[PDB]
Structure formats: C-alpha cells, structure tokens
Design a protein around this ligand. Structure first.
Ligand SMILES: O=P(O)(O)O[C@H]1[C@H](O)[C@@H](OP(=O)(O)O)[C@H](OP(=O)(O)O)[C@@H](OP(=O)(O)O)[C@H]1O
Length: 119
C-alpha cells in the first residue's frame, strides 16, 4: 500500500451523506473499507482513465473528486459490496472525498495522480 487513511466519502442518491471510510491506494486501484482491518473491501475503484480535481463543498473541508474527463454522462467503473455480500457495479459518476486536513488532501492527490499514470 502506497497510502492508506481515513477519508469521508459522499454517496447516496436523493439525500447524499458523508461516510468515514478507510482508503487504501494500491497500484491503479483505490479501495475503501468500513473498518481498518476488514478482509474484504466495501469498494474498489480502478484509477485508469480517471482524473482528480479539487472542488469546493459547502459543508466539508479539503475536498476533491475522482471523475471521467469530458464525461458526457457515464458512470465510473467500480465494484461495490452490499450488506448481503452481493457484488454490484458502482453507481457514481464522480467520487467526492473529504480529507481531514489540507495536507492530507495534497498527499492523497499526489499519491493518486501518480498511481493513475505509469500502468
Ligand atoms: O448508508 P446510506 O445512508 O444508506 O448511504 C449509502 C452509503 O453512503 C454507501 O457508501 P459505502 O458503500 O461506502 O458504505 C454508498 O455506496 P457507494 O460506495 O457506491 O458510494 C451508497 O450509494 P449508492 O448505493 O451508490 O446510492 C449510499 O446509498
């Protein structure tokens, strides 16, 4: 793992709520878990063909988003796990994330940008 840490992630549909998740950046893939020691990830996000951009949020600090450039409306390819264990495709067009400090933000971006390239 090149980087791991707690981050708040925005999810839901109509009402979007922030969830604290444990992220693990590892070779072209960004995983996230509910608990720091869980064996199976709550989500896997392949980084190929994605970019990051900082964004401003009204309720949360140090945010940034994973997104598909020039997106005409497609969803980010990713797998997700359901409370019943069933695996399904992610339903995000973008992943908005909140880092605890501005420093953790720049590190995560630098780490992720570098993880999207040489692969
Ligand atoms: O807990 P509640 O309030 O029900 O909201 C859930 C969680 O935020 C999920 O995050 P996590 O999987 O990290 O627990 C998220 O899945 P994503 O991981 O795909 O964001 C769901 O988004 P959608 O199922 O896509 O609407 C959203 O409905």
């Amino acid at each position: 793992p090149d980087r791991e840490g707690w981050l708040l992630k925005l999810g839901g549909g109509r009402v979007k709520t922030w969830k604290r998740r444990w992220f693990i950046l590892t070779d072209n893939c960004l995983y996230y878990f509910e608990y720091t020691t869980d064996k199976e990830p709550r989500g896997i996000i392949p980084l190929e063909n994605l970019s990051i951009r900082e964004v401003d949020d009204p309720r949360k600090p140090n945010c940034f988003e994973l997104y598909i450039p020039n997106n005409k409306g497609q969803l980010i390819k990713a797998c997700k796990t359901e409370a019943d264990g069933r695996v399904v495709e992610g339903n995000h067009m973008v992943y908005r994330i909140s880092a605890p400090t501005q420093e953790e933000k720049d590190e995560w971006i630098k780490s992720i940008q570098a993880a999207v390239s040489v692969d």
